[PDB]
Write a protein of this length. Structure first.
Lengths: 189, 189
């Protein structure tokens, strides 16, 4: 009974959809679930080739300073969320620093290279680590990736501002790690 | 924009579900759509490990001779229907001969080896051939696979009987090749 009859690490009904949270200067300005496998984060949706879903950054309510930085996105940021995990590719001139499970060690800024793909989260490692965790033999695996967009302001007191931040995760990972907390919640009531 | 952002040969909404047709001695005794990725063709569903969907052969109406042959299926036949195509593995002592797109050339019987996996249909070849076909530069690709189960009857006039036959195809392939015929049908009325 092999090979192609083998069972997968996760059922076929798995939800690898991308949960996005957009943050302007410390405040959450909105959430978006993306069910397509790939998408492009964009300042505004254009006619474009149309090879991908375009995901528009929210309109910033105080309007600026964030709108000045949204206007530098140009082609923006590619994101892929699939059975393998989460991938991103910076297309914009803006520096993007990232924190995610696959990040290298150190404090220093992990910066997304221009025009190059980066795997932020691996479903195979998360799944292996989650199983050891629930067997009490490990720490809980991480699953959230965060992109931090930066802008220079020479002459202000904060010479670099993280004006915009994007948190990303796959739906299935959050679901599995909320099952025990959800039971604890129900017991409080 | 690569690699993982690439576009697939077929949309993500693709229906690779397995369409089964069961035939006892020349008559169709039933049809079954299987939406699981793998399944086991069985005489009757048992408690079993439960690692797969079990698909029961129909109860034969005249009852026999076919029931004698269904009772030799033992563990039966594994089938996998996925984005790669159609795969089968004979678990039964019954000889199964097959006709499908990947069959070798010749008339002679193509027999499924015991405890060994056989790819009957490849979505990559079908898709490449279909495109050339619709461009008028090729013949239409085939997509149906047929398994022929056999039983000896020394002393009858047909010393080998093909009592049971199973036709298999993936839903998407039939759909695409019926689109033009469906238009022709509508024009007749």
């Amino acid at each position: 009974e092999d090979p192609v009859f083998l069972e997968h690490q996760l059922p076929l009904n798995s939800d690898y959809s991308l949960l996005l949270t957009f943050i302007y200067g410390g405040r959450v300005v909105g959430k978006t679930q993306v069910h397509s496998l790939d998408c492009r984060l964009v300042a505004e949706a254009s006619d474009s080739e149309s090879s991908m879903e375009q995901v528009e950054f929210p309109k910033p309510d105080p309007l600026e300073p964030t709108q000045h930085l949204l206007n530098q996105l140009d082609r923006g940021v590619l994101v892929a969320s699939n059975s393998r995990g989460l991938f991103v590719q910076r297309l914009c001139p803006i520096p993007i620093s990232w924190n995610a499970p696959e990040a290298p060690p150190g404090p220093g800024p992990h910066l997304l290279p221009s025009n190059k793909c980066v795997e932020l989260f691996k479903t195979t490692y998360f799944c292996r680590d989650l199983a050891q965790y629930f067997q009490g033999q490990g720490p809980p695996p991480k699953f959230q990736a965060t992109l931090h967009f930066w802008e220079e302001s020479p002459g202000s007191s904060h010479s670099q501002e993280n004006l915009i931040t994007v948190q990303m995760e796959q739906a299935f990972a959050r679901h599995l790690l909320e099952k025990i907390p959800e039971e604890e919640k129900a017991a409080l009531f």
